[PDB]
Short mmCIF file of C-alpha atoms and ligand atoms in Angstrom, two decimals:
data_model
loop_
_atom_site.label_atom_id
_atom_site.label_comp_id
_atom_site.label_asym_id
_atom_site.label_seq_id
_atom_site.Cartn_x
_atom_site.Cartn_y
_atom_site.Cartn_z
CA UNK A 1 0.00 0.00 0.00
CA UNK A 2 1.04 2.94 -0.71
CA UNK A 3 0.11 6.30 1.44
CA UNK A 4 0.26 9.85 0.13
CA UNK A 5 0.24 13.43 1.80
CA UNK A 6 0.04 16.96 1.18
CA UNK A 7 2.83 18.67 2.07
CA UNK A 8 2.49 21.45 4.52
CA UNK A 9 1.87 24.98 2.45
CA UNK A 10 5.38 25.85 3.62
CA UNK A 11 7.43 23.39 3.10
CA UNK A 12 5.40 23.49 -1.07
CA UNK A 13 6.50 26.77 -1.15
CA UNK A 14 9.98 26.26 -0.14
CA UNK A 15 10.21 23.48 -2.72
CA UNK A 16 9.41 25.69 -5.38
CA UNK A 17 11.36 27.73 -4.56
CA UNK A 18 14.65 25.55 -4.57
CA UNK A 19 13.41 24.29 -7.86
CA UNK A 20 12.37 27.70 -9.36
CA UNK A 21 14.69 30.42 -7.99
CA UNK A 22 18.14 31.29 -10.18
CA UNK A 23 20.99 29.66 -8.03
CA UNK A 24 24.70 28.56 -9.75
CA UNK A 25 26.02 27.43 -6.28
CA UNK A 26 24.23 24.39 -6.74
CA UNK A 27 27.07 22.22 -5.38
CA UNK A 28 26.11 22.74 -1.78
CA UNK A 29 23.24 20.03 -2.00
CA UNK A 30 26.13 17.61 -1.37
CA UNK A 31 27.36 19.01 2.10
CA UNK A 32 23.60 19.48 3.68
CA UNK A 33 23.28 15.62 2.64
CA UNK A 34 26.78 14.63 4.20
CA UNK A 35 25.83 16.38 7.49
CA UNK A 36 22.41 14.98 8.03
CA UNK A 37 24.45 11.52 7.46
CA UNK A 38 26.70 12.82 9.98
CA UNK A 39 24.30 14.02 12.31
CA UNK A 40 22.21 10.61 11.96
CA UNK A 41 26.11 8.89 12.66
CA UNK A 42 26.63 11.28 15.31
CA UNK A 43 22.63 10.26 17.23
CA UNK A 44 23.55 6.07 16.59
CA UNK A 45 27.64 6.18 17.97
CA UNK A 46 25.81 8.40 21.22
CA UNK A 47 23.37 5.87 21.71
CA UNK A 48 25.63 2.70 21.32
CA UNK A 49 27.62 4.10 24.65
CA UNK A 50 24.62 3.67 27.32
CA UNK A 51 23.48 0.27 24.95
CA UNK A 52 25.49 -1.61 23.07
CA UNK A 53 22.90 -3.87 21.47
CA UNK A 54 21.65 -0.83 18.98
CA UNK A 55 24.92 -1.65 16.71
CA UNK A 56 23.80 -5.14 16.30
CA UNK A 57 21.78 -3.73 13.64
CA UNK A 58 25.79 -2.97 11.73
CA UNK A 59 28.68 -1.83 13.90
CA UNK A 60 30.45 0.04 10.81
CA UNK A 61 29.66 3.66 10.97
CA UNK A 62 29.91 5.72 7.33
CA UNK A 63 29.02 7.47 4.15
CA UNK A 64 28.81 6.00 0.59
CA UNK A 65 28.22 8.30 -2.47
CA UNK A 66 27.30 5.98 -5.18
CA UNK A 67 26.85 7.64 -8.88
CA UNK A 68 25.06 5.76 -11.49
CA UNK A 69 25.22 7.84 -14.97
CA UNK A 70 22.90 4.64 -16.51
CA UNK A 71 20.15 5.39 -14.41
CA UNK A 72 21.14 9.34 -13.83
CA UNK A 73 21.24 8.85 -10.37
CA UNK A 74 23.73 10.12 -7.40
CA UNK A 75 22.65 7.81 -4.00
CA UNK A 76 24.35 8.94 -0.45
CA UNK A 77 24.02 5.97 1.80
CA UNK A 78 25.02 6.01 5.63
CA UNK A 79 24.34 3.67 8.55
CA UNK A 80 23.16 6.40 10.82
CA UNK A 81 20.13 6.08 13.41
CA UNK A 82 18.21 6.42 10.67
CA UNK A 83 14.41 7.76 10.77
CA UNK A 84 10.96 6.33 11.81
CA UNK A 85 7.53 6.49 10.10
CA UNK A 86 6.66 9.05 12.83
CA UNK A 87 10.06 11.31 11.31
CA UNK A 88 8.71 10.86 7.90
CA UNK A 89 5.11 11.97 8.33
CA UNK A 90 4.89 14.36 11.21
CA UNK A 91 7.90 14.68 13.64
CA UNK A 92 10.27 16.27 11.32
CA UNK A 93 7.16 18.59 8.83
CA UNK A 94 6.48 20.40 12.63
CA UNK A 95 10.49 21.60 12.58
CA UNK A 96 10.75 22.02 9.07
CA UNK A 97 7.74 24.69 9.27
CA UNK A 98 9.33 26.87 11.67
CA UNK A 99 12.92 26.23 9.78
CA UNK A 100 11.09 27.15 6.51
CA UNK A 101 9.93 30.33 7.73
CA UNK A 102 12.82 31.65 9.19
CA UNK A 103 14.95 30.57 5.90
CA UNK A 104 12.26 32.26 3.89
CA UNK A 105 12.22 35.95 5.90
CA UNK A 106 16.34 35.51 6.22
CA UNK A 107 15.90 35.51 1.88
CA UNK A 108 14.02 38.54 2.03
CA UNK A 109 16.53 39.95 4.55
CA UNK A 110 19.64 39.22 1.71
CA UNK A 111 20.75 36.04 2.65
CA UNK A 112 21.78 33.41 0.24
CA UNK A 113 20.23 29.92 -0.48
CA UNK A 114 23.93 28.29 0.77
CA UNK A 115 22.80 29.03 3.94
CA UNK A 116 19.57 26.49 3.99
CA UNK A 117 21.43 24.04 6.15
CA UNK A 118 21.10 26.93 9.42
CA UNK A 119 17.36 26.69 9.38
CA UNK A 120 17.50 22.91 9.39
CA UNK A 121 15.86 22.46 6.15
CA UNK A 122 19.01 21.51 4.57
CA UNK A 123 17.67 17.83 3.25
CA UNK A 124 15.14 19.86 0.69
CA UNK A 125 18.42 21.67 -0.86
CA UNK A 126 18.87 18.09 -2.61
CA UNK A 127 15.98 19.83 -4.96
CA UNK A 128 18.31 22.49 -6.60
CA UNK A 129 19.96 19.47 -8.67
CA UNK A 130 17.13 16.89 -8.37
CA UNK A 131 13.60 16.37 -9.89
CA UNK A 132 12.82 13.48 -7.59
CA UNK A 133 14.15 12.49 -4.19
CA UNK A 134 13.65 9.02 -2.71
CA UNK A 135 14.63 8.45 0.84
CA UNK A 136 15.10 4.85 1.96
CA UNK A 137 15.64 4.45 5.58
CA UNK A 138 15.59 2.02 8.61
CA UNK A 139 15.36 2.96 12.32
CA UNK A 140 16.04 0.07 14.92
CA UNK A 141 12.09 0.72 16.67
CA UNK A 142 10.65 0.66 13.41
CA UNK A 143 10.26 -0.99 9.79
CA UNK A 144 11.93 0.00 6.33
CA UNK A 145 10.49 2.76 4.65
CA UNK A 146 10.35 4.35 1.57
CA UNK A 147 9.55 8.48 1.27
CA UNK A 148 9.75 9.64 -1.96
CA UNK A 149 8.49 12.89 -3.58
CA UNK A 150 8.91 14.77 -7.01
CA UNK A 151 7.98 18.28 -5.29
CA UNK A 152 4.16 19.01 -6.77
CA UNK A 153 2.69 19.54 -2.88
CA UNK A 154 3.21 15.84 -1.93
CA UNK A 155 4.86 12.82 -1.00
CA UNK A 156 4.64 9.18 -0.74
CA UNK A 157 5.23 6.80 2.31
CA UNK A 158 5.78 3.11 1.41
CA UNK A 159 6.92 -0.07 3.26
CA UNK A 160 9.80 -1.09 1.56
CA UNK A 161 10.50 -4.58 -0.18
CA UNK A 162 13.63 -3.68 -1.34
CA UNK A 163 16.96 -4.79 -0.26
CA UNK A 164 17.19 -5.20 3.87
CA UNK A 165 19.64 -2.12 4.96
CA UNK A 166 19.70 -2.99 8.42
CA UNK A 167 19.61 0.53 10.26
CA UNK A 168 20.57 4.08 8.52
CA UNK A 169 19.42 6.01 5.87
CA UNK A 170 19.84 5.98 1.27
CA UNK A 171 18.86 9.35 -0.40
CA UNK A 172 18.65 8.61 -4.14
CA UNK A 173 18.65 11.84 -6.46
CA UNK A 174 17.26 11.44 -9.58
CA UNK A 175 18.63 14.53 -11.05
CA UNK A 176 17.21 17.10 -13.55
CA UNK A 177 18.80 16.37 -17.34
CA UNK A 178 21.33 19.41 -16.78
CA UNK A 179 22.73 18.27 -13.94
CA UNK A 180 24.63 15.04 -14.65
CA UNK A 181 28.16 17.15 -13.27
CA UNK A 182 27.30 15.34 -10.06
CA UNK A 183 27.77 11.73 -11.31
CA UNK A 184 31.72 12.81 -12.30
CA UNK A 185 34.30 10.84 -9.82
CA UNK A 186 36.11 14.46 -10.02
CA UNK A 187 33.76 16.96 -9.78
CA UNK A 188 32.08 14.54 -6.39
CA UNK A 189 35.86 15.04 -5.15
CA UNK A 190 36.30 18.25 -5.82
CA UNK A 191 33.17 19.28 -3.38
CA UNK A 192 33.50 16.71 -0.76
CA UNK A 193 37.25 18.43 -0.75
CA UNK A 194 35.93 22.01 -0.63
CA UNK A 195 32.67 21.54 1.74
CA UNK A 196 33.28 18.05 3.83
CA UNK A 197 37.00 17.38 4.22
CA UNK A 198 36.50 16.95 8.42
CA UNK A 199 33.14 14.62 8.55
CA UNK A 200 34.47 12.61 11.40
CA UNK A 201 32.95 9.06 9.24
CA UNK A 202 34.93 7.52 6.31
CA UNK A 203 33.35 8.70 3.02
CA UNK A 204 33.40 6.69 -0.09
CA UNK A 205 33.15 8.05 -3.45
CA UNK A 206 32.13 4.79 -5.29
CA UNK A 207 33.14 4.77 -8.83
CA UNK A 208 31.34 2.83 -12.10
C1 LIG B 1 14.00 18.36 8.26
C2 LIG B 1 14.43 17.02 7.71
C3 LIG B 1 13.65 16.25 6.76
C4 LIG B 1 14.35 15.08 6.51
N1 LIG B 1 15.52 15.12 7.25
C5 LIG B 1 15.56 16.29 7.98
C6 LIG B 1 16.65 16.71 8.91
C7 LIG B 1 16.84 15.79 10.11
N2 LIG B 1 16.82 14.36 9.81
C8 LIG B 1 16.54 13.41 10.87
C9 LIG B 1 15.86 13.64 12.17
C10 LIG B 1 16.04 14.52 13.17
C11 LIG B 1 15.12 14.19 14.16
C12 LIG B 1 14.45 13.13 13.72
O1 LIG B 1 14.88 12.77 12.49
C13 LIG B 1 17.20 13.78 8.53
C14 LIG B 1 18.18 12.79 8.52
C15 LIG B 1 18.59 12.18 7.33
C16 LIG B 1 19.62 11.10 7.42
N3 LIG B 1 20.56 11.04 6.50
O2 LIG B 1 19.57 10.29 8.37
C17 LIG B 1 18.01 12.62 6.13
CL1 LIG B 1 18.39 11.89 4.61
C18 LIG B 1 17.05 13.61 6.12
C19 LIG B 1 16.60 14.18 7.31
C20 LIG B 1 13.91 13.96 5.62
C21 LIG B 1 12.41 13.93 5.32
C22 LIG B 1 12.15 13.05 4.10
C23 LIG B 1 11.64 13.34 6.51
C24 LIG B 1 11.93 15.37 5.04
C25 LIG B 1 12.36 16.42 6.04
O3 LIG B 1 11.63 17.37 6.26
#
């Protein structure tokens, strides 16, 4: 079965305007993605201290950038906490709201879109280079889910049958035609150099 919702009015209008809005520094996606990863990383090693048994869903703690150029897709993969169905549907919309807001009046104010990831709405930044997001993701309290949303004012929420993760969280970017830069081995370098070169987690830049 699969369950769709309206995005909240504010969160819509952000989206458009990530997708809409005349932005170069596009590159930046990449670092909100690597440090919700390491945030997620960051929530799982924390946990593991006071109980040890929440790493026997994987003990390895990192970040995979997989680029396909076959199916035009960039994936970031990390075996962070991961998120619930509760995250997915109404936990994290209440905090994105508030984010959005602030982000939006800051805009007015002068400020640039680079500085999305402030506001905590950095995940919807993957929209400036993709024209559909799916996020795949596995909490320990909780089943494998499937989010996935093309921006148009809502999203989908789907069990997954996929390939068992065991705990963390897969973003798969389907990016827009003109964006295909982001599948290059060197120009996936080149940023994680400029914008991530001290995420405290082993990043690998898969190649094909
Ligand atoms: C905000 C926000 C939002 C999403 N993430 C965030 C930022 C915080 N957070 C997790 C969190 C904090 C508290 C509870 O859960 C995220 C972690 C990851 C990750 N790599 O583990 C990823 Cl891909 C996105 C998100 C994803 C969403 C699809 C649910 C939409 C959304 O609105």
């Amino acid at each position: 079965e699969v369950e769709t919702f309206a995005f909240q009015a504010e969160i819509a209008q952000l989206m458009s305007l990530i997708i809409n809005t005349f932005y170069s520094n596009k590159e930046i996606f990449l670092r909100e993605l690597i440090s919700n990863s390491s945030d997620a990383l960051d929530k799982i090693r924390y946990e593991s201290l006071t109980d040890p048994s929440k790493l026997d869903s994987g003990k390895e703690l990192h970040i995979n950038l997989i680029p396909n150029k076959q199916d035009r897709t960039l994936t970031i993969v990390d075996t962070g906490i991961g998120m619930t169905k509760a995250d997915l549907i109404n936990n994290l919309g209440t905090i994105a709201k508030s984010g959005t807001k602030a982000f939006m009046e800051a805009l007015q104010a002068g400020a640039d879109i680079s500085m999305i990831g402030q506001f905590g709405v950095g995940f919807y930044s993957a929209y400036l280079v993709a024209e559909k997001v799916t996020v795949i993701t596995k909490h320990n309290d909780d089943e494998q889910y499937a989010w996935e949303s093309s921006a148009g004012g809502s999203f989908t929420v789907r069990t997954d049958t996929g390939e068992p993760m065991g705990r963390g969280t897969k973003v798969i970017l389907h990016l827009k035609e003109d964006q295909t830069e982001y599948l290059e081995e060197r120009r996936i370098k080149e940023i994680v150099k400029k914008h991530s070169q001290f995420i405290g987690y082993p990043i690998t830049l898969f190649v094909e």
